[PDB]
Design a protein around this ligand. Structure first.
Ligand SMILES: *[C@@H]1O[C@H](CO)[C@@H](O[C@@H]2O[C@H](CO)[C@@H](O)[C@H](O)[C@H]2NC(C)=O)[C@H](O)[C@H]1NC(C)=O
Length: 597
């Protein structure tokens, strides 16, 4: 008996939009946390870099095994029911990805595995790896957590937008296409922003080794807190969508406005065959490939590049891309989408709109490449340590006494402006830590250095972290990075907007699945390997003495990576130019075939 005006105003075509972005927002909020959550799980919990990608890969293929199946199933049944169910399986997944943190907080603290580590012995506390059991058990919680993510997450991004296609007019779908994309972006922001404020250490970064044993508690409990709230929201949003009508009263009024004036295998193939037989969609999908190839690569390569040429803390460097690529992205859909929506752009109009959009963007990427040419301050990698030892001498006497470990080595600055790695390897037999900085004392393995130096309560000492005197180029880099990002997000709307037009209304449901199948398999499966091979190409100088099978590098080649990664994007960006010049002529030929004035 719910005949209140609400459920009549809650069956509005925006009443579906209100819950979809509400469904998307927590969906956006979820994944961004997980990538770091997976990443920190690898480093913290005694994993290899081999298994982490496998956990990452689990989300990707899970969407791929449902990007087609649910699309065939979304065509035949109620879209509203399936989305909330896929919203429901978000709730099951998100808490499930938080059970191992609470159940297995005993995996690897510094001293909480009492059976084998003695509280007085230091070598005992870092060996007897009982952490690798109760680790692979969690990975089963985690590979499940990643798989339930993609199997259920993908129908949310297919069916909901399909409901936007088939129920909302064209001249405002891009207005709705943009917000849905951005609601995934805004969760990419806060998935890092909200999550990391708890993962990033408390006001006490700088106490005795209890802090690694206290930071350990706040990350598992940090996500176990976060996912408990996240998952339940995915339930209450699903419960509201289930109450939404099967027969949408909003579309029925519009359907009669647009009415006037089996998914068999062969019929499935009839949809499959025309797509290849229409070289318009052929270009649309591959243009998206270079779009995602250059995008995803940058959002990964950039914090690594800011860590190697601009010498920015890897935790801080990751933030720099995360907190700054979105402001370009959000308006890129917002301004990009509203251009077609306000102007009711035609198929010929958007193709011209896409070309000049990308062409200037590449010259912006090219402009960034020109900026890389400028010289920057160089720390370490000065070939054999001033004649006192070779690369790898690094394991001298002062390494052994303060127990330096070749995996977490960081560069520290001496007063000679020379950059020394492994602040404890600097021979610093004493360290007094203040409230706002970390400093090292009695730094023996330092060279004369120490021209004027300074301090107050103590005299002379070296300051932890890298010292940078010429990082101004940084504002040029982001500035050029922003406008390239904006152009990218206003390339997405033109390609996705066209796909709706050249497909009949009943077949638009299977349209999203066709392109979405290429998203995770053809692109995201071969991509990491293409990066990984060329990642070592600039990371040649691996720590061969300790890490073993390429676990930690020391020379991410600041000249080769710049030429390789951005050149690949230069190779990648231009493919869109060739694809679209192929499309526009073919589009104009085929449109001519239907016009033949
Ligand atoms: C290491 O630094 C400390 C202070 O940061 C220096 O302190 C001296 O330590 C010796 C121990 O042999 C004491 O006899 C002195 O009285 C300490 N000095 C003061 C002012 O308290 C210590 O000298 C440094 N190590 C070396 C090898 O010089």
């Amino acid at each position: 008996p719910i005949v209140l005006p609400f459920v009549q105003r809650f069956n509005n075509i925006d009443g579906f939009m209100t819950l979809y972005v509400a469904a998307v927002l927590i969906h956006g909020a979820l994944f961004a946390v997980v990538d770091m959550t997976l990443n920190i799980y690898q480093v913290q919990f005694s994993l290899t870099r081999t298994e982490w990608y496998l956990m990452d890969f689990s989300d990707y293929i899970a969407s791929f095994v449902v990007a087609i199946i649910i699309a065939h199933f979304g065509s035949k049944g109620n879209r509203t029911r399936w989305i909330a169910a896929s919203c429901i399986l978000m709730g099951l997944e998100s808490m499930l990805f938080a059970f191992p943190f609470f159940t297995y907080e005993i995996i690897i603290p510094g001293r909480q595995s009492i059976e084998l580590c003695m509280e007085e012995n230091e070598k005992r506390n870092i060996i007897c790896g009982n952490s690798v059991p109760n680790r692979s058990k969690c990975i089963y919680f985690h590979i499940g957590g990643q798989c339930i993510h993609g199997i259920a997450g993908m129908p949310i991004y297919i069916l909901g937008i399909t409901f936007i296609f088939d129920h909302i007019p064209t001249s405002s779908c891009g207005f709705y296409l943009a917000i849905g994309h951005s609601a995934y972006l805004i969760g990419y922001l806060l998935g890092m922003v909200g999550g990391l404020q708890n993962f990033q250490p408390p006001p006490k970064e700088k106490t005795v080794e209890i802090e690694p044993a206290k930071v350990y508690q706040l990350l598992q409990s940090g996500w176990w807190k976060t996912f408990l709230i996240i998952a339940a929201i995915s339930f209450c949003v699903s419960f509201m969508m289930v109450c939404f009508p099967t027969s949408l009263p909003g579309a029925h009024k519009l359907r009669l406005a647009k009415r006037k004036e089996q998914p068999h295998l062969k019929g499935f193939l009839h949809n499959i065959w025309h797509i290849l037989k229409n070289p318009l969609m052929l270009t649309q999908a591959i243009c998206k490939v270079s779009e995602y190839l250059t995008f995803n690569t940058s959002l990964y390569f950039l914090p690594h590049h800011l860590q190697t040429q601009f010498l920015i803390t890897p935790g801080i460097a990751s933030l720099l891309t995360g907190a700054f690529v979105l402001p370009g992205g959000i308006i890129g859909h917002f301004l990009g989408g509203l251009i077609v929506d306000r102007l009711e752009m035609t198929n010929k109009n958007k193709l011209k709109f896409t070309l000049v959009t990308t062409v200037v963007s590449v010259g912006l990427f090219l402009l960034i490449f020109f900026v890389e040419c400028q010289t920057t301050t160089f720390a370490g990698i000065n070939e054999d340590y001033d004649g006192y030892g070779q690369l790898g001498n690094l394991t001298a006497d002062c390494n052994e006494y303060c127990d330096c470990t070749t995996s977490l080595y960081t560069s520290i600055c001496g007063r000679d402006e020379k950059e020394y790695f492994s602040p404890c390897f600097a021979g610093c037999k004493a360290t007094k830590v203040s409230q706002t900085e970390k400093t090292y004392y009695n730094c023996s393995c330092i060279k004369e250095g120490l021209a004027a130096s300074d301090d107050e309560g103590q005299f002379i000492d070296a300051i932890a972290g890298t010292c940078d005197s010429d990082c101004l180029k940084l504002p040029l880099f982001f500035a050029f990075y922003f406008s390239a990002t904006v152009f990218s997000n206003m390339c997405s709307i033109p390609v996705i907007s066209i796909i709706l037009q050249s497909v009949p209304a009943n077949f638009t449901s299977l349209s999203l699945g066709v392109t979405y199948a290429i998203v995770k398999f053809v692109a995201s499966v071969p991509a990491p390997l293409l990066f990984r091979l060329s990642s070592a190409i600039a990371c040649i100088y691996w720590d061969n003495n300790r890490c073993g099978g390429k676990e930690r590098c020391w020379i991410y080649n600041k000249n080769i990576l710049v030429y390789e990664f951005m050149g690949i994007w230069m190779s990648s960006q231009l493919i869109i130019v060739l694809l679209n010049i192929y499309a526009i002529q073919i589009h104009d030929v085929v449109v001519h075939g239907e016009i033949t004035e």
